[PDB]
Structure 1
Amino acid sequence: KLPAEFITRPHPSKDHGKETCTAYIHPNVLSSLEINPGSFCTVGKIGENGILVIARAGDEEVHPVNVITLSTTIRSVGNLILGDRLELKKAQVQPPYATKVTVGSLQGYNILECMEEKVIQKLLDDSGVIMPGMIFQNLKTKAGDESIDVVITDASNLFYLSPPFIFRKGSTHITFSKETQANRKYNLPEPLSYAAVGGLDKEIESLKSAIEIPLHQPTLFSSFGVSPPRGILLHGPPGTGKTMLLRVVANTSNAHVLTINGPSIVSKYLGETEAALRDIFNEARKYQPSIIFIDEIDSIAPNRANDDSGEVESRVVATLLTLMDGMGAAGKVVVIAATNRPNSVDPALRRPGRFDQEVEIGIPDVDARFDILTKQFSRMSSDRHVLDSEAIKYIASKTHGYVGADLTALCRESVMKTIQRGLGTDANIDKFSLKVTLKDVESAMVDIRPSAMREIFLEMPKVYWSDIGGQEELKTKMKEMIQLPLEASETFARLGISAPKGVLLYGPPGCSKTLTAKALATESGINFLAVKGPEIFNKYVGESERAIREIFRKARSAAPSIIFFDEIDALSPDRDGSSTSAANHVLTSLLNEIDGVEELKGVVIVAATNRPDEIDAALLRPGRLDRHIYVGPPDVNARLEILKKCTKKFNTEESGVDLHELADRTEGYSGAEVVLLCQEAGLAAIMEDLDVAKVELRHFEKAFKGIARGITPEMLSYYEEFALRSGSSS
């Protein structure tokens, strides 16, 4: 037969001889494809342009049919990871002679620091076909150089990744260049290393120790008593970069690589679905060392506790259990599982012996965000125009609550900011020379949102601090409780303390209260959350706490964050004894979640209600509602700024409407009462004349005769007793 499935294996001999481009595939496949042992063949990934490799006939008795052997440079050109599938094709065009070939090095070393140019001709003389991107290492060093590497950056094309050419020693023009990157015009890929990943350096070091040793030195653990650990349990919140870490291991480790991502093993036939797992493992054990990569294992390995698990899925997870333990290898094969839900892993998988090594893919903090953002601009330094160690820190610090995925989108949106500006200034301007400045990132900041906030939808009209007048005491506390913990986190560590996470706001009707939260949604520097209570309550039993858990789950990942609880009195259960069925469990869940974020987390709880005395005494325990702030009614000074808040656009300065006269007459006015007077008086002016240019005093006079007081004297008395309630005088 002529199977269409093939695998890649490195050449048995690595000596930079005549096998630089000639590769042995199969004695019979070439005959079945009418390919002579030495003719032209096209090899590449499915759906991608192949690489013109030289076909050769090997030993049919020893070489398996499904195995394809390549050279030491073919896999480096297209980043062909070992074990990837291949699509054999043919080339029917005699390649044009290479007029110019470029010689470069990835390590930043000039080619003059390598062997003599006469040796260079001998290095690549029998290759026959040369395409850009050929990387060959382990070359002889004339001097005491640590390591050298030569990459053909460019050379000078139907369904071909790189332009085919025929090299000719003694008649090919050779130019020496210092290029260290693959050509961008050819859109060549780049290998990924450990330093290519920013922020998560600590997890990489643990991973490298637990991967390199079993693959290359399996006898160390065997001579050390216990067998080396088998199975890697890689878990992390979404957006941290779990998928790339498995690729990084594949791109770093030099061994057979097999990837099992998604439900790719599910087959219509009953026996075919379970047979796929056995075939993959048998291939891995046949060419050890090898690595098996599993992504989203929880999607194919149900926890089996719930009743939604199917019979087919239960057999799939059981196959790994019966095969992980039942192998004769000492641990040369390493299995890595990637998932985002620690609790969704199968209980049998979590048992010892299956996932011995558990690695948490941490969310980058402020310090880590500086590291990742700095490295991202390294690969785009040609058109960077970004300050070093100064602009990156400012951008990284302001990216509170980021998980890592939003940073790539933010940088991508930074380019889009220049596109709108670049094309707006000139429709035919050159967009390749555009550079991202500080303002572009700030503009892209509002157009890039955290992933945790995608499930929260609130209008939140833009209300600033200026919308609140005469509340310096309220403004005094907010800056200390929000800015100080993050802007001066080292001071807290110097004192070894954490700022209190509780505040019990209370204000008369018409004051800010909720309006301050709109300013918090405007001037906080971090993510803001609000609850439209009592929507958390649900008809079904047990969903009242689950609704809180789901909303509070985002807070941990997006820590630090601020959650606003409007009208928290309804959240607290009623003690009158009416309808006390499910609200009692709500109180217990809220208290327990407060204590659960004490490990130097940035979770902040903000509450405001009109009935401070109707809440349970548990919320008055320190650590839940620490500060009792009396945001009282606006006074004369406050209403002076309140008038300028909404009547700044009004032309009261020219004639009429004296702010000082209103301030004396508006004693006891809340923030809403002052606004109500403007709405009532303004309607008088509009009816008098459709075109309004100024407002007279008589407009307010008619309004004043029909406005009541929304702050009763008893309302103030309720809060004063609440403010001083622990024995009053005592």
Structure 2
Amino acid sequence: DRTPPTKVSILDIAGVDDTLQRLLKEVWFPLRGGEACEKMGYRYDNGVLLHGPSGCGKTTLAHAIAGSIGVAFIPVSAPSVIGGTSGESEKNIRDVFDEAIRLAPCLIFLDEIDAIAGRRESANKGMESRIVAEIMNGMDRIRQNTPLGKNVVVLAATNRPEFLDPAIRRRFSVEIDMGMPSERAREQILRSLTRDLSLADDINFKELAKMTPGYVGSDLQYVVKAAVSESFQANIDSLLAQARAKHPADHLANVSQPQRDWLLLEAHRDEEVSWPSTKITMEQFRKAVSLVQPASKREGFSTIPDTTWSHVGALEDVRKKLEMSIIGPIKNPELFTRVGIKPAAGILLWGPPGCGKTLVAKAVANESKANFISIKGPELLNKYVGESERAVRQLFSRAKSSAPCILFFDQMDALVPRRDDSLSDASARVVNTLLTELDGVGDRSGIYVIGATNRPDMIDEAIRRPGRLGTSIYVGLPSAEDRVKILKTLYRNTVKAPQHQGTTDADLEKVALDLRCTGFSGADLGNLMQAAAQACLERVYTQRQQKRKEEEEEIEPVITMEDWEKALNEVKPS
């Protein structure tokens, strides 16, 4: 078996243009330009490493390169060349390299180098170091035993380059990082995948790339399949209706509607009808967002909050400040960079206690359509010496992974004390890391930090430096008349489910002027409405088990004044 390549050609891959260009100069040139090596009398062989996150299409890229070059290609997987009998797996590697040198020129894709060559330092078992030594000797066999006219190139891929032994890691000449696709790369991948498929003219790939911060190419491959399935859903329902009308015959049985129609589909079988030509509607792409989970979800993704600026009352000047400071750079980075405005990485919110300042950050996150990550107050402070700052640094690393990102801390007053006084030592060990991280990335990384505090005058001055959390904004408390819109939008987007109901919009205005509902914010009003609905449902459940006992129906979801009255008598501010 000469191991011929396949047809996974470049037309199916995109978004890796920066990396793919380097391959043109590093792997294509030696493989078929070996005649240049022979004429120059210079052995020109190389080993290329493609290290990147899992599910980035590395196998597809290798297959595409092998198919495009057209030379022999021998893929090797790490588990497939491991034998229980100690002394035969090394024979397998030797035979693979002998085949490579014999069937020259060719390309070797030794997949999952991390699973075959670990660290020799901790390799107690002789097999682990034996494999590394075998690869080391085989690389020299490659470099020497060549016909001088047709060199061979070795391609390897992994996910943890640090896990590789330093010796084997050094042998691969150029290590290429295929990071998470950017907006342009994601748009290119989405448009390339939807190549042969008929697309609706209103499909906008740009804002497709815009709502997917943390997805990966494989995640996009699942998303396109989900959207295709949703498009086929309407055609399947149309087929079901066409079967119900084409051969009604009342029914051939009395089992169930899906089974009853599937009998008709079975009965037709050979009969065929023209299939309507449907184009994937843009609504289905947005529907597919929830159908495919992101790879970077479990790692504290904290999906974009659904709360909008409606949930917060008035504060127009505050919203203008936020739009000009954070939203604007994210919305139109080109326009702001035209003026040369470096996006400030830090903003500070101070004033009343932690009533609803979190919702302010969620509003910015939703407006910017960027990932939001929060922290449960001073949860980062632990008794151990080292892990106190390790979580802080992991936060910023994850924010690097999911760009853009929103890192909103909670109650910094207990996490970054003023270190001017010669008091406490562990606290300084964390604030120093915080200053370093803030100073590190504020320009174009897209990771903006939002402060949360209620005594800004007692916070340390080094953080309030410009570029860091130096933008101080005083978020107050919404007034009574502001609560009119808040209650209306809270009730409207939640229930609104069918004159004879218990909406009573005037009751919302009456509640908004409650004398005992003073210290309430966007979160407090939402909690109050939740409590009122819970009390109303309690009343419904109580009444349903008495009047029916002495059965009419599930009587009513009607919400009366007494529900809100008991809620306000059973609510505590802050």
Q: Distance in 2 between matches of 1:253 and 1:417?
A: 37
Q: CA deviation at 1:488?
A: 1.7
When residues 205 and 708 of structure 1 are mapped into structure 2, their CA distance, relative to the original with a 3 A threshold, is closer
Q: CA deviation at 1:221?
A: 4.5
Q: CA deviation at 1:280?
A: 0.8
1:276 aligns with 2:92: yes
AA aligned to 1:633 is L
When residues 547 and 273 of structure 1 are mapped into structure 2, their CA distance, relative to the original with a 3 A threshold, is farther
When residues 653 and 622 of structure 1 are mapped into structure 2, their CA distance, relative to the original with a 3 A threshold, is same
Hey, what does 1:402 align to over in structure 2? Answer: 215
**Structure 2: where are the runs of 5+ without partners?**
243-273, 496-500, 544-555
Q: Aligned residue pairs: how many? A: 518
Hey, what does 1:513 align to over in structure 2? Answer: 357
8 Å Cα contact 1:526-1:560 kept in structure 2: yes
For residues 49-448 of structure 1, the aligned pairs below 5 Å read: 81=4, 191-221=7-37, 227-304=43-120, 307=122, 310-326=125-141, 327-329=144-146, 330=148, 332-351=151-170, 354-380=171-197, 384-387=198-201, 391-424=204-237, 427=240, 433-448=277-292
Q: Distance in 2 between matches of 1:255 and 1:684?
A: 74
Which of 482, 487, 491 is equivalent to 1:638? 482
Normalising by the residue count of structure 2, what TM-score does the alignment of the two structures yield?
Answer: 0.77
Normalising by the residue count of structure 1, what TM-score does the alignment of the two structures yield?
Answer: 0.62
CA deviation vs aligned residue, 1:58-86 (integer Å, no higher than 9, x gap) = xxxxxxxxxxxxxxxxxxxxxxx25xxxx
AA aligned to 2:513 is L
When residues 468 and 283 of structure 1 are mapped into structure 2, their CA distance, relative to the original with a 3 A threshold, is same
When residues 600 and 212 of structure 1 are mapped into structure 2, their CA distance, relative to the original with a 3 A threshold, is same
8 Å Cα contact 1:470-1:639 kept in structure 2: no
For residues 579-594 of structure 1, the aligned pairs below 5 Å read: 580=424, 582-594=426-438
Q: CA deviation at 1:577?
A: 9.3
AA aligned to 1:489 is P
When residues 665 and 311 of structure 1 are mapped into structure 2, their CA distance, relative to the original with a 3 A threshold, is same
Q: CA deviation at 1:444?
A: 0.8
When residues 549 and 644 of structure 1 are mapped into structure 2, their CA distance, relative to the original with a 3 A threshold, is same
Q: Distance in 2 between matches of 1:660 and 1:344?
A: 62
Hey, what does 2:246 align to over in structure 1? Answer: none
AA aligned to 2:193 is Q
8 Å Cα contact 1:510-1:672 kept in structure 2: no
AA aligned to 1:325 is D
When residues 325 and 559 of structure 1 are mapped into structure 2, their CA distance, relative to the original with a 3 A threshold, is same
Cα RMSD, aligned residues only: 3.9
Q: CA deviation at 1:411?
A: 0.5
Q: Distance in 1 between matches of 2:462 and 2:69?
A: 55
AA aligned to 2:159 is N
Rg bigger for which structure?
A: 1
8 Å Cα contact 2:45-2:151 kept in structure 1: no
Q: Distance in 1 between matches of 2:180 and 2:210?
A: 14
Q: Distance in 1 between matches of 2:564 and 2:286?
A: 44
Q: Distance in 2 between matches of 1:478 and 1:449?
A: 30
AA aligned to 2:378 is P
CA deviation vs aligned residue, 1:419-455 (integer Å, no higher than 9, x gap) = 4444445536688844311010011123333311233
When residues 685 and 261 of structure 1 are mapped into structure 2, their CA distance, relative to the original with a 3 A threshold, is closer
1:601 aligns with 2:452: no
CA deviation vs aligned residue, 1:364-395 (integer Å, no higher than 9, x gap) = 32222232222222222xxx23228x622232
AA aligned to 2:111 is D
Does the residue aligned with 2:462 lie in a helix, a strand or coil? helix
Hey, what does 2:550 align to over in structure 1? Answer: none
AA aligned to 1:626 is G
Hey, what does 1:717 align to over in structure 2? Answer: none
8 Å Cα contact 1:520-1:528 kept in structure 2: no
**Structure 1: where are the runs of 5+ without partners?**
1-6, 10-80, 83-189, 711-730
Hey, what does 1:135 align to over in structure 2? Answer: none
AA aligned to 1:243 is T
Greater RCO structure (CA 8 Å; 6+ sep): 2
1:662 aligns with 2:513: yes
When residues 209 and 565 of structure 1 are mapped into structure 2, their CA distance, relative to the original with a 3 A threshold, is same
Does the residue aligned with 2:107 lie in a helix, a strand or coil? strand
Q: CA deviation at 1:281?
A: 0.5
When residues 619 and 524 of structure 1 are mapped into structure 2, their CA distance, relative to the original with a 3 A threshold, is same
8 Å Cα contact 1:229-1:357 kept in structure 2: no
Q: Distance in 2 between matches of 1:657 and 1:323?
A: 79
Q: CA deviation at 1:602?
A: 1.4
Hey, what does 1:180 align to over in structure 2? Answer: none
Does the residue aligned with 1:269 lie in a helix, a strand or coil? coil
Q: Distance in 2 between matches of 1:294 and 1:498?
A: 44
Q: Distance in 1 between matches of 2:140 and 2:219?
A: 40
Identical counterparts, % of pairs: 38
AA aligned to 1:605 is V
Q: Distance in 1 between matches of 2:187 and 2:571?
A: 56
AA aligned to 1:639 is R
Q: Distance in 2 between matches of 1:540 and 1:581?
A: 13
